[PDB]
Design an enzyme around this catalytic site. Structure first.
Site, PDB file in Angstrom:
ATOM      1  N   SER A   1      -8.084  -5.539  14.001  1.00  0.00           N
ATOM      2  CA  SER A   1      -7.438  -5.888  15.300  1.00  0.00           C
ATOM      3  C   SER A   1      -6.823  -4.647  15.933  1.00  0.00           C
ATOM      4  O   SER A   1      -6.233  -3.818  15.239  1.00  0.00           O
ATOM      5  CB  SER A   1      -6.369  -6.960  15.100  1.00  0.00           C
ATOM      6  N   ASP A  76       2.287  -8.447  -4.540  1.00  0.00           N
ATOM      7  CA  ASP A  76       2.236  -7.725  -5.801  1.00  0.00           C
ATOM      8  C   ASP A  76       1.614  -8.613  -6.868  1.00  0.00           C
ATOM      9  O   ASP A  76       1.746  -9.843  -6.832  1.00  0.00           O
ATOM     10  CB  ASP A  76       3.629  -7.272  -6.253  1.00  0.00           C
TER      11      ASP A  76
HETATM   12 CA   LIG Z   1       1.398  -4.641  -3.820  1.00  0.00          CA
END
Ligand SMILES: [Ca+2]
Ligand SMILES: [Ca+2]
Ligand SMILES: [Ca+2]
Ligand SMILES: [Ca+2]
Ligand SMILES: [Ca+2]
Ligand SMILES: [Ca+2]
Lengths: 536, 191
Positions: A1, A76
């Site tokens: 984008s 994460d």
């Molecule tokens: Ca990460």
């Protein structure tokens, strides 16, 4: 984008400008939904992603806004240490812990229409959903989102951005948006503003953010950074902000996806357009969008390097003088201005081949053991930073090859590209012109679930937003033009014939035609085809 | 509560309401009227019920969607923690969708798109949690990634091939800690 905002100092008319270009694929029905919203104290026109109760690409009475995916480090992976005898237990903060279990029943339509049933169990740890359990290695991987549980808060923030009227209100909404989006602002005073939004975890100092974090508790998130530390600027003295999913600021990091943000980055196409023009209008922005949509992205850094190497070995090969001149005269685009179905510049075919051969000569051998995983990095959609550094003789951590070895790859790859073109197409650039790549608005979007029947109408391929707004915040309000392909309405009649507004913007999209941005009631009435009442 | 809807030459609906509560209900209604089958499949995607209509080919997709998703009750807690006006508007948005569903069910062969007839299933009522699911199903795609695992596999194999010292250097070139020459959207020196 991609996105652009232009302050009054950079705007030919003195009015701030805003350009939107969300890249969410080309599908039918479309990924976007355009709407006009008008109630006492609230007027806004534009589009948002399908199903969203707010406009993401448009303008209200006072401000225009758009967004691009931030690619900030908001996910994460934690490597949980499994119980040796029970893969549903993991060690955390000094004690074995049970994963949270839950059973789900899936009903599956059989080939004979009869409904079958499958039962499965899913797991979460303290860090999030378990995406994989590796019993042989004694580990599982859980997925932590810095925005976990705050998605409704994000929706509310986007609604406040719709209602914002000055920038104080827009900044507050941005401070409340917890997911990783860049937000862009422009108002009728001439201001522009930029916010790289999203909750940033405060991570353990000892952890390599490119790799999974150990889940035993010593390396947990320690909090979240205050929004005041997120990248953001109001009225930068260069008078503009452009973005094509690139790095927000020089101080910012994003861990495991850093290879998205390298010296060679596709946003360069938008930077070039701004730097080569002292001031811009909406027509300039459209020229920049056009350039970016058809640019061969490797040209910016690699074509000057190629041209120089060819000139330095010019007397070694008889075809180089002609090749050098074709590259120099080439505007770096793969376009079809005359609409004959052929890319206008045949030398682009040479350059496509040269890059392909060069990339493989750089990395096929050294990375043969991981090429299935590293190819998306070394030949990335946004750039090829490592490849450039090696070929340009710039400093790298690993000594891939000398400057001389790199020169030889450039020459060898050039000769091979020429040889193949001479064998297959001819001796003149016009013989090399390749047929255009085309695309259709398909039936399945990025969510990976068929949502309709798509479309069969092909158009030239474009590295371009699924919609475009070109907005100028005049003192009397927002004005401009936009396009929202394939069409407004996804209805298909039982007869098999699609709605009149199913696909009536596809050719306008392909031909760089736009419809007027409608905002005040006078111009909405003039455009009215039908008027209708409604209830609660 | 009454809302006027003006369709332009491209079919775009321009809503004119007396308040936001009616505005957002008309918002959901016109979007449902234009894209009902698309909304249904997007909700089914998030809920992991695509296989109910499209068969066993979507079983793994459904399982992944439920694996990482939120329960109906967890989304209720998210809604309860919103401010009063936004929560009410999301509700009105859902009722507007539900409204066209009711309208469409009473006259299927004229108001339900061919996809429903071909695949032989119907749309269903919508609540405020379903509206959140339309947001979860798409916006999460731009945030979610498992590249930490892919990097670990890259580094692990490079270590097996080149040893630890060179493998880290190669890894530093493939997935850098930072590239200070990377073009940035803003620059501190520009203020
Ligand atoms: Ca990460
Ligand atoms: Ca001005
Ligand atoms: Ca001014
Ligand atoms: Ca111009
Ligand atoms: Ca042509
Ligand atoms: Ca539901």
């Amino acid at each position: 984008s991609n996105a652009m905002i232009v302050g009054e100092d950079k705007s030919k008319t003195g009015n701030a400008l805003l350009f939107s270009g969300p890249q969410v694929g080309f599908v039918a029905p479309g990924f976007l939904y355009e709407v006009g919203l008008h109630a006492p104290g609230f007027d806004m026109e534009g589009s948002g992603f399908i199903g969203y109760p707010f406009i993401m690409f448009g303008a209200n009475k006072h401000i225009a806004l758009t967004a691009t995916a931030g690619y900030g480090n908001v996910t994460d992976i934690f490597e949980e240490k499994l119980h040796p005898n029970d893969p549903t237990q993991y060690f955390y903060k000094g004690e074995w812990r049970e994963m949270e279990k839950r059973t789900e029943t899936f009903t599956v339509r059989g080939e004979d229409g009869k409904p079958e049933q499958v039962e499965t169990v899913f797991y979460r740890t303290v860090h999030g959903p378990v995406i994989s359990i590796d019993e042989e290695r004694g580990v599982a991987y859980s997925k932590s989102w810095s925005f976990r549980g705050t998605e409704a808060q994000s929706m509310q923030a986007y609604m406040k951005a719709n209602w914002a009227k000055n920038l104080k209100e827009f900044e507050e909404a941005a401070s409340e948006y917890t997911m990783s989006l860049n937000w862009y602002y422009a108002d009728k005073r001439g201001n522009i503003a930029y916010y790289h939004a999203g909750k940033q975890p405060v991570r353990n100092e000892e952890i390599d953010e490119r790799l999974p974090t150990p889940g035993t508790g010593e390396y947990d998130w320690q909090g979240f950074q205050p929004f005041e530390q997120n990248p953001q600027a109001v009225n930068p003295d260069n008078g503009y902000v452009v973005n094509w999913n690139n790095k927000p600021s020089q101080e910012w990091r994003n861990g495991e996806r850093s290879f998205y943000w390298g010296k060679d980055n596709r946003v360069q196409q938008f930077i070039n357009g701004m730097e080569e023009r002292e001031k811009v209008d909406l027509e300039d922005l459209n020229e920049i969008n056009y350039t970016a949509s058809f640019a061969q992205l490797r040209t910016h850094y690699f074509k000057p390097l190629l041209i120089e190497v060819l000139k330095e070995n010019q007397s070694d090969n008889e075809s180089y003088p002609y090749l050098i001149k074709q590259l120099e005269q080439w505007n770096n685009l793969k376009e079809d201005k005359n609409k004959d179905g052929l890319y206008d510049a045949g030398v682009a075919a040479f350059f496509d081949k040269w890059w392909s051969i060069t990339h493989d000569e750089l990395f096929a051998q050294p990375l043969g053991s991981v090429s299935n995983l590293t190819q998306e990095i070394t030949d990335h959609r946004y750039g090829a930073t490592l490849a450039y550094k090696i070929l340009a003789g710039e400093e790298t951590n690993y000594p891939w090859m000398s400057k001389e070895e790199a020169e030889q790859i450039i020459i060898n790859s050039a000769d091979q590209a020429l040889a193949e073109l001479h064998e297959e197409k001819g001796t003149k650039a016009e013989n090399w012109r390749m047929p255009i790549d085309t695309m259709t608005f398909g039936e399945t979007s990025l969510i990976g679930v068929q949502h309709g029947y798509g479309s069969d109408t092909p158009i030239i391929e474009m590295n371009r937003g699924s919609e475009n707004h070109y907005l100028e915040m005049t003192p009397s309000g927002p004005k401009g033009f936009n396009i929202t392909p394939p069409g407004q309405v996804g209805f298909i009649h039982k007869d098999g014939t699609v709605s009149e507004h199913y696909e009536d913007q596809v050719q306008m999209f392909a031909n760089w035609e736009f419809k007027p941005f409608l905002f005040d009631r006078k111009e909405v009435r003039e455009a009215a085809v039908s008027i209708t009442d409604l209830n609660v | 509560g009454d809302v006027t809807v003006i369709r332009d030459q491209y079919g775009v609906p321009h809503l004119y309401a007396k308040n936001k509560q009616d505005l957002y209900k008309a918002y959901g209604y016109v979007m449902a009227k234009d894209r009902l089958f698309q909304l249904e499949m997007f909700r089914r995607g998030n809920e992991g019920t695509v296989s109910e209509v499209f068969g066993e080919e979507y079983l793994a997709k459904d399982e992944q969607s439920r694996r990482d998703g939120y329960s109906d009750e967890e989304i209720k807690e998210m809604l309860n923690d919103l401010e009063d006006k936004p929560r009410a508007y999301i509700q009105q948005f859902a009722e507007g969708i539900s409204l066209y569903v009711q309208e469409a069910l009473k006259n299927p062969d004229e108001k339900l798109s061919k996809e429903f007839h071909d695949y032989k299933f119907l749309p269903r009522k919508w609540d405020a949690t379903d509206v959140v699911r339309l947001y979860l199903v798409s916006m999460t795609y731009f945030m979610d990634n498992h590249q930490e695992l892919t990097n670990a596999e890259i580094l692990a194999k490079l270590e097996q091939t080149y040893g630890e010292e060179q493998a880290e250097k190669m890894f530093d070139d493939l997935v850098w800690k930072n590239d200070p020459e990377a073009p940035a959207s803003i620059q501190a020196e520009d203020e």
